[PDB]
Write an enzyme that holds these catalytic residues in place. Structure first.
Site, mmCIF file in Angstrom:
data_model
loop_
_atom_site.group_PDB
_atom_site.id
_atom_site.type_symbol
_atom_site.label_atom_id
_atom_site.label_comp_id
_atom_site.label_asym_id
_atom_site.label_seq_id
_atom_site.Cartn_x
_atom_site.Cartn_y
_atom_site.Cartn_z
ATOM 1 N N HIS F 53 -9.073 -41.898 -35.532
ATOM 2 C CA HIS F 53 -8.313 -42.273 -34.342
ATOM 3 C C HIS F 53 -8.692 -41.381 -33.157
ATOM 4 O O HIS F 53 -8.933 -41.845 -32.039
ATOM 5 C CB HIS F 53 -6.811 -42.158 -34.600
ATOM 6 C CG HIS F 53 -6.234 -43.253 -35.434
ATOM 7 N ND1 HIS F 53 -5.257 -44.103 -34.956
ATOM 8 C CD2 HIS F 53 -6.436 -43.615 -36.721
ATOM 9 C CE1 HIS F 53 -4.901 -44.946 -35.909
ATOM 10 N NE2 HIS F 53 -5.608 -44.674 -37.003
ATOM 11 N N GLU F 122 -1.155 -39.787 -31.157
ATOM 12 C CA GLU F 122 -1.657 -40.606 -32.259
ATOM 13 C C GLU F 122 -0.750 -40.468 -33.471
ATOM 14 O O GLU F 122 -0.713 -41.339 -34.341
ATOM 15 C CB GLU F 122 -3.056 -40.182 -32.721
ATOM 16 C CG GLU F 122 -4.186 -40.822 -31.926
ATOM 17 C CD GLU F 122 -4.076 -42.271 -31.473
ATOM 18 O OE1 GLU F 122 -4.419 -43.179 -32.262
ATOM 19 O OE2 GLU F 122 -3.670 -42.480 -30.308
#
Ligand SMILES: CCCCCCCCCCCCCCCCCC(=O)OC[C@H](COP(=O)([O-])OCC(O)COP(=O)([O-])OC[C@@H](COC(=O)CCCCCCCCCCCCCCCCC)OC(=O)CCCCCCCCCCCCCCCCC)OC(=O)CCCCCCCCCCCCCCCCC
Ligand SMILES: CCCCCCCCCCCCCCCCCC(=O)OC[C@H](COP(=O)([O-])OCC[N+](C)(C)C)OC(=O)CCCCCCCCCCCCCCCCC
Ligand SMILES: CCCCCCCCCCCCCCCCCC(=O)OC[C@H](COP(=O)([O-])OCC[N+](C)(C)C)OC(=O)CCCCCCCCCCCCCCCCC
Ligand SMILES: CCCCCCCCCCCCCCCCCCCC(=O)O[C@H](COC(=O)CCCCCCCCCCCCCC)COP(=O)(O)OCCN
Ligand code: HEM
Ligand code: HEM
Ligand SMILES: CCCCCCCCCCCCCC(=O)OC[C@H](COP(=O)([O-])O)OC(=O)CCCCCCCCCCCCC
Ligand SMILES: CCCCCC[C@H]1C(=O)O[C@H](C)[C@H](NC(=O)c2cccc(NC=O)c2O)C(=O)O[C@@H](C)[C@@H]1OC(=O)CC(C)C
Ligand SMILES: CCCCCCCCCCCCO[C@@H]1O[C@H](CO)[C@@H](O[C@H]2O[C@H](CO)[C@@H](O)[C@H](O)[C@H]2O)[C@H](O)[C@H]1O
Lengths: 54, 383, 85, 124, 75, 438, 61
Positions: F53, F122
């Protein structure tokens, strides 16, 4: 040890054959073993022990 | 929901005797099933009654049967009912098997009820044979002697098996006591198999005389078949009455009213009439072992009908050649019966061999040929 | 292969009307005389050969065999019996 | 037996001039004596249906043909139980005795027998 | 370039073929042995089995040759 | 006859592997890494997926926004996935856009910012992914299957990691993970399609030259897994379809039995009621299932890892009253790999595989995935000629031998999800792993 | 308590050597011993029990 498994246990036909052959051997030897044991614990008591007098 | 459907126990009765869906067109030959149920009930009732008066000891057995005839209230009736209903059981069982062969009840999907049926037929033979021994008259003894000496033909162990079944070196008291116990038991086993063949049949339902599906047009088992079954019950009881009350010894053999005597051999050892076809088959083969195998094969060969009937059509209603072949088969089975009671003399020896060949060749040759040809005739003939 | 009421396993039916009357409204023995005579005659005539042929054949066979057997065990049949054994 | 077997064998017979000359008249007589037409059946109505193959062929019948078959079976069952025969229009005339089901069962069986063959194929 | 797949249909019957059955031949062997051992085991007591089979086995066979001394035998 | 796969090394030990195709106009370059979730311990489990990510959250030069724009200006796309043993980051582009894409991938792997602000952002996105995988039933089933088969071992951990770790992953531990694991000797730069190998090698010398080397350079695809026969039931009566996986311990990539296990897998095969042809497939299980409507689908699989594998089947079914029959018939078909398979089935399945292993490679992404997978698992690309020889060497006798050692009467890992009331207990399923008649 | 991928603790019961042939063989030795004694016991039972049907001592005299 894998060898033992593969030969006698893996196929059920072999396992059942092994069990019945073992049963035969056990049956015969156990008979003999009990006979001898029974004769020792009942020594001088049984007919076989006194038969010699006659 | 109605109780008869809700309750598990009631529901099982319901599914067999009340709401059971039947074809609407069963003819009177579908009534032998319930007559065989009636025979089985009469045999249990009379049988258990005789057991309350019978003594299984060989010194007393024959005398106990005389006591039943002479001293027990209605003993004569219970004895003759039991003895004659054994004959009627075989009339009904041959009729029921005949119905099943003619209408192709042995075909898929009813191979399992048929195959269990063949076992019921064997148990009935064994049951009736042992019952015959219990009287311990001359036919009782000489029957047990000869029939159990057939087992002597089993190679190597045959003799040993015979002595084991007799419980001694000849038919005597041990044999009689053990046949009593088994003859009492076997009818219960027979009842269980009768019930299994019905449970097996429940998956497909009854066949019908047209051999088509009946899924299109069903009738509840009650009241339609209930009331139809009463007609044959009363017809049966009329025939029963004529034998039991008016001619109780017509179907039997006088030799069984002589007490067993191991020394004196009777004039003629012939079995009860219903065993006679198998007896004729056995006499046809000269070899002792051959004869026994043939006799057993004559019953077990029924198990292959599902294979050897190659017809695309179930049953004989529509098959003129099969009907003729079946007529010849049934008459030959009766001729075998007759040859079972003649003496082993010319010209019946050769005749018995020919009839035995015909019996087997029906299953092995003719039925497969005829059913194949009829398949072709139906197809070409309707183009 | 067979279901139960409601799902017996019939192909779907449509277009058949069935009619019947009550047992109390019917004469149960209507035309019984006609059926007992004419219908039974028809049905028996149609099946007669399938009974007559095998019965007549096996009866003839038996008759011949029983008569031969009887004759072999007479005085007249002594010689033919001796050969047959 | 399989319907395929019956059909193939019949075709062998119909091919041979000799064989057809002697068999086709017999088969016509046989069917007259068989007497299924007197209960208003078509030949194919008599084929044993309690088989997975035949159940499948029956499900593949066009709805019309299927409804008609159900009526013929119900009608015949009623004549059977009454011990009457068909009269008049109920009797199946030779021209009406069409093999309505044979095409369907031959297709079902064709596939079933191909399936058996192909289950036994050996790559070379 | 390949025009057609190359295969044969092996003979078969009731859904059995020779390749498959040949794999099971050994297993019927073992089951037959199991049935043999089992049957013989069940009738080991039968005097005829001892007389005719079991007493003839080398070395082991004397296990089944047993005499009651005539002094101890009512029969 | 496919073009030759060229392979070069750099000084640091980065492998460059390329398969050019002058018929196409696109290229897939990417980096296959011999590292994945399995490389984490229990405290930093989920790091590898977390990094995936953050890799797209901006570098020391280009910000998150600049990154997005740079890729949009290239024309193609980037994609990444993390598995248990492998991480992939690739870029599909145009022929002459390859220098841009290699430069971007080199940037996101070596020079990622991993700023506390982005880690924190995230951390919520990934937390929400824990409650949305729940929908991907096949993945749920396979994740439980690994969890149970390799209970309390590295392979048994999930890729996402526990909720607890997601809240405690720092930029420090992320940096530490990719410094220990994403080393030159564990990475393969792969180009498929319109790539020149010599051009790709020059781009690697330009961009991947200052990659860390590991202290102890082992060969690519170098690894202790102890399978646990076990079951997870996740009964959910509200679901319409049951999903069931059954697996036994399978084979590693470098097993001698790798191809034998694939042939065995092909003998059972796949089935899907939605595909037209599936009712006609030769597989015995396929026939039973289709005739009896026992299942919507089944998919045989043989997943390999460096040192173990799982071999099994994944079934789905709405027939909730005959799940017992479905499982019964499936396991009896496996029994036949031990008892009954002959030249008939084995030659058929070899024929299907000889094509299947080549058919899979039908676009540049699939070719790149094949080069990448093989280089990171076997250390070389196996040519189709070698693959055809290895398949030809598989006999019926080999398959029977393999099945008798691997499947017959062995413990299974079993996962059921959905309306699985009808799935019997462990013993009865495991009892079908042998035949009493044999 | 929440994650279903965290398999509960089974370490109290898991055998370390669980996938060895040694391990399976042992349990089948127990099952097979039990089958062996059952076979020997059934033979003994049947042989002794059915011998009642053989000639009894009074008959043998
Ligand atoms: C013994 C124990 C006592 C219990 C009695 C039970 C017997 C009842 C039974 O099953 O048979 C009755 C049974 C009558 O049953 P049904 O339900 O009216 O029709 C059954 C037939 O399938 C229907 O057969 P069909 O419709 O073709 O009629 C044929 C029958 C005519 O049927 C008649 O009843 C007239 O006539 C013959 O076959 C006689 C042959 C020629 C003799 C010269 O009698 C026969 O049909 C006998 C034919 C056997 C040869
Ligand atoms: C004595 C020989 C009997 C042969 C029968 C031939 C058919 C016939 O005409 O019967 C009438 C009927 C004909 O009935 P059907 O059902 O074929 O015909 C009814 C009318 N149609 C054609 C319109 C549908 O057959 C029977 O009912 C036969 C039942 C057989 C029972 C046999 C018992 C013998 C025991 C031996 C056991 C081994
Ligand atoms: C009553 C008499 C019982 C005698 C048992 C005879 C020997 C069979 C036996 O022990 O069963 C073991 C066998 C095998 O037990 P099993 O089924 O646990 O073993 C199967 C797995 N392999 C083949 C790898 C061992 O059981 C049966 O076959 C069932 C028959 C018993 C009844
Ligand atoms: C043996 C002796 C038989 C004597 C019993 C017969 C019943 C006496 C008359 C009673 C009666 O007709 O009424 C029905 C009772 O029958 C019944 O409920 C039974 C119907 C037939 C009686 C037995 C069925 C035989 C079937 C199988 C024979 C098995 C033999 C094996 C042992 C009910 O009339 P309804 O219920 O139709 O409705 C009508 C509205 N309620
Ligand atoms: C005690 C002996 C038996 C009893 C009480 C018995 C009873 C019945 C009954 C009640 C039925 C259903 C009704 C009927 O069709 O008549 C039936 C059907 C049947 N029986 Fe029997 N039976 C007996 C022996 C046999 C034997 C010996 C056979 C075969 C050798 C047999 C084979 C069948 C078959 C195949 C059916 C299905 C026939 C059909 O409906 O199409 N049974 N039996
Ligand atoms: C299918 C059922 C049965 C059949 C076919 C059957 C058949 C026979 C036959 C054929 C006899 C020889 C009859 C004679 O000539 O006197 C007989 C006798 C006997 N049966 Fe049964 N039987 C059956 C059921 C039973 C049952 C359940 C009992 C219960 C004990 C029983 C008890 C007896 C007794 C005590 C005798 C000897 C007394 C006598 O001969 O009358 N029977 N049986
Ligand atoms: C003592 C107890 C005896 C138990 C004996 C069991 C024997 C069963 C053998 C058996 O099932 O053979 C199957 C084999 C064909 O294989 P398939 O169609 O099952 O793959 O079938 C054929 O090969 C024919
Ligand atoms: C009381 C519920 C318990 C279920 C079993 C009891 C009996 C039972 O089911 O009865 C039914 C009345 C049955 N008849 C039929 O199937 C039948 C079906 C179709 C047409 C006709 N006839 C045509 O017109 C029938 O006759 C019958 O006689 O079979 C007995 C044998 C059964 O006995 C047993 O199996 C148990 C034991 C006594 C043998
Ligand atoms: C389908 C099953 C197969 C058929 C079954 C066989 C039935 C009977 C066979 C053997 C019966 C007689 O066989 C005999 O058995 C008895 C005990 O059981 C044994 O007898 C032995 O043990 C008993 C006690 O156990 C002692 O009283 C005896 O003195 C001793 O000799 C004989 O050594 C054996 O010869």
């Amino acid at each position: 040890a894998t060898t033992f498994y593969n030969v006698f246990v893996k196929r059920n036909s072999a396992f059942v054959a092994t069990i019945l052959a073992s049963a035969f051997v056990f049956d015969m030897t156990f008979e003999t073993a009990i006979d001898n044991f029974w004769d020792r614990i009942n020594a001088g008591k049984q007919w076989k022990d006194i038969r010699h007098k006659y | 929901m109605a109780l008869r459907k809700k309750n598990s126990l009631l529901n099982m009765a319901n599914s067999y005797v009340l709401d059971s869906p039947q074809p609407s067109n069963l003819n009177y030959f579908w009534n032998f099933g319930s007559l065989l149920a009636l025979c089985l009930v009469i045999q249990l009732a009379t049988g258990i009654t005789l057991a309350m008066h019978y003594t299984s000891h060989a010194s007393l057995a024959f005398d106990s049967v005389e006591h039943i005839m002479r001293d027990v209230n209605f003993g004569w009736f219970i004895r003759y009912a039991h003895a004659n209903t054994a004959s009627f059981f075989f009339i009904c069982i041959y009729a029921h098997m005949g119905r099943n062969i003619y209408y192709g009840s042995y075909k898929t999907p009813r191979v399992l009820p048929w195959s269990i049926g063949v076992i019921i037929f064997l148990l009935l033979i064994i049951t009736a044979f042992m019952g015959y021994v219990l009287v311990f008259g001359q036919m009782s003894l000489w029957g047990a002697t000869v029939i159990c000496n057939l087992v002597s033909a089993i190679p190597w162990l045959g003799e040993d098996i015979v002595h084991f079944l007799w419980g001694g070196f000849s038919v005597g008291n041990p044999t009689l006591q053990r046949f009593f116990a088994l003859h009492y038991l076997m009818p219960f086993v027979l009842a269980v198999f009768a019930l299994l063949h019905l449970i097996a049949l429940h998956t497909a339902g009854s066949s019908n005389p047209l051999g088509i599906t009946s899924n299109v047009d069903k009738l509840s088992m009650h009241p339609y078949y209930s009331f139809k079954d009463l007609i044959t019950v009363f017809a049966f009881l009329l025939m029963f009455t004529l034998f039991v009350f008016f001619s109780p010894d017509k179907l039997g053999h006088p030799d069984n009213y002589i007490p067993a005597n191991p020394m004196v051999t009777p004039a003629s050892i012939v079995p009860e009439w219903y065993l006679l076809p198998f007896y004729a088959i056995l006499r046809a083969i000269p070899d002792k072992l051959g004869g026994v195998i043939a006799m057993v094969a004559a019953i077990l060969i029924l198990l292959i009908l599902p294979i050897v009937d190659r017809s695309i059509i179930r049953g004989n209603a529509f098959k003129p050649i099969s009907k003729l072949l079946f007529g010849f088969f049934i008459c030959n089975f009766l001729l075998l019966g007759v040859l079972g009671q003649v003496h082993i003399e010319p010209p019946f020896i050769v005749l018995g061999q020919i009839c035995t060949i015909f019996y087997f060749s029906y299953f092995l040759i003719l039925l497969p040929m005829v059913s194949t040809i009829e398949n072709i005739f139906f197809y070409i003939g309707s183009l | 292969y067979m279901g139960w009421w409601g799902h017996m396993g019939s192909p779907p039916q449509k277009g058949i009307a069935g009619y019947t009357i009550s047992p109390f409204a019917a004469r149960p023995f209507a035309g019984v005389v006609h059926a007992a005579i004419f219908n039974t005659f028809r049905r028996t005539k149609n099946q007669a050969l399938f009974v007559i042929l095998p019965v007549s054949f096996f009866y003839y066979v038996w008759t011949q065999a029983s008569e031969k057997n009887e004759w072999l065990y007479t005085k007249a049949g002594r010689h033919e019996l001796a050969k047959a054994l | 037996a399989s319907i395929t077997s019956v059909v193939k064998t019949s075709e062998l017979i119909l091919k041979s001039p000799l064989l057809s000359k002697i068999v086709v008249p017999l088969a016509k007589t046989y069917v007259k004596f068989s007497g299924y037409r007197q209960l208003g059946f078509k030949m194919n109505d008599l084929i044993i249906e309690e088989t997975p193959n035949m159940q499948l062929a029956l499900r593949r019948l066009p709805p019309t043909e299927s409804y008609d078959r159900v009526y013929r079976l119900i009608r015949a069952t009623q004549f059977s139980l009454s011990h009457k025969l068909a009269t008049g229009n109920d009797i199946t005339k030779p021209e009406e005795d069409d093999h309505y089901l044979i095409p369907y069962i031959l297709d079902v069986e064709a596939e079933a027998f191909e399936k058996d063959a192909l289950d036994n194929l050996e790559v070379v | 370039y390949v025009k057609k797949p190359s295969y044969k249909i092996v003979p078969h019957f009731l859904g059995f073929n020779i390749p498959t059955v040949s794999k099971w031949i050994p297993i019927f062997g073992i089951w037959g042995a199991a049935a043999g051992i089992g049957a013989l085991f069940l009738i080991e007591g039968v005097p005829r089995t001892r007389q005719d089979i079991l007493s003839k086995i080398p070395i082991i066979g004397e296990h089944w040759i047993r005499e009651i001394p005539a002094s101890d035998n009512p029969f | 006859v496919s073009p030759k796969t060229r392979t070069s090394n750099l000084k640091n030990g980065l492998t460059i592997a390329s398969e050019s195709n002058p018929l196409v106009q696109t290229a897939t370059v990417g980096v296959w890494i011999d590292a994945g979730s399995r490389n984490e311990n229990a405290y930093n489990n989920g790091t590898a997926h977390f990094f995936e990510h953050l890799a797209f959250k901006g570098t020391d030069k280009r910000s998150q926004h600049q990154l997005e724009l740079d890729i949009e200006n290239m024309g193609g796309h980037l994609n990444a996935y993390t598995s248990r043993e492998s991480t992939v980051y690739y870029a599909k582009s145009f022929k002459d856009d390859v220098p841009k894409s290699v430069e971007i991938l080199a940037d996101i792997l070596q020079h990622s910012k991993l700023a506390e602000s982005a880690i924190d952002r995230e951390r919520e996105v990934i937390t929400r992914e824990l409650e949305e995988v729940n929908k991907q039933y096949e993945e749920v089933v396979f994740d439980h299957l690994h969890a149970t088969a390799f209970m309390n071992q590295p392979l048994g951990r999930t890729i996402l990691g526990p909720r607890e770790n997601i809240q405690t992953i720092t930029n420090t531990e992320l940096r530490k993970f990719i410094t220990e694991n994403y080393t030159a000797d564990r990475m393969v730069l792969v180009g498929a399609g319109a790539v020149d190998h010599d051009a790709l090698v020059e781009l690697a010398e330009k961009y991947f030259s200052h990659l860390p080397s590991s202290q102890s350079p082992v060969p690519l695809g170098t690894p202790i897994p102890n399978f646990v026969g076990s079951e997870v039931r996740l009964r959910d009566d509200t679901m319409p379809v049951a999903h069931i996986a059954i697996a036994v311990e399978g084979v590693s990539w470098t097993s001698e039995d790798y191809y034998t296990a694939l042939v065995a897998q092909a003998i059972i095969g796949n089935y899907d009621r939605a595909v037209g042809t599936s009712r006609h497939q030769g597989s015995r299980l396929s026939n039973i299932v289709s005739e009896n409507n026992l299942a919507n689908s089944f998919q045989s699989f043989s997943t390999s890892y460096s040192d173990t594998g799982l071999w099994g089947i994944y079934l789905t079914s709405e027939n909730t009253t005959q799940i017992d029959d479905l499982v019964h018939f499936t396991l009896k078909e496996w029994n036949r790999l031990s008892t009954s398979v002959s030249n008939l089935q084995v030659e058929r399945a070899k024929s299907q595989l000889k094509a299947g292993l080549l058919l899979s490679l039908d676009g540049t992404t699939y070719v790149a995935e094949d080069i990448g997978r093989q280089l990171t698992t076997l250390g070389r690309r196996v040519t189709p000629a070698e693959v055809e020889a290895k398949l030809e060497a598989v006999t019926e006798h080999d398959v029977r031998a393999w099945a008798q050692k691997t499947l017959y009467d062995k413990d299974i890992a079993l996962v059921g999800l959905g309306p699985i009331e009808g799935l019997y207990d462990y013993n009865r399923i495991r009892n079908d792993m042998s035949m009493m008649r044999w | 308590g929440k994650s279903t991928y965290k398999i509960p603790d089974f370490t109290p019961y898991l055998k370390k050597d669980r996938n060895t042939d040694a391990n399976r063989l042992f349990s089948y030795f127990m099952i097979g011993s039990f089958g062996m004694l059952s076979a020997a016991g059934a033979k003994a039972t049947v042989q002794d029990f059915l011998s009642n049907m053989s000639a009894s001592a009074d008959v043998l005299a």
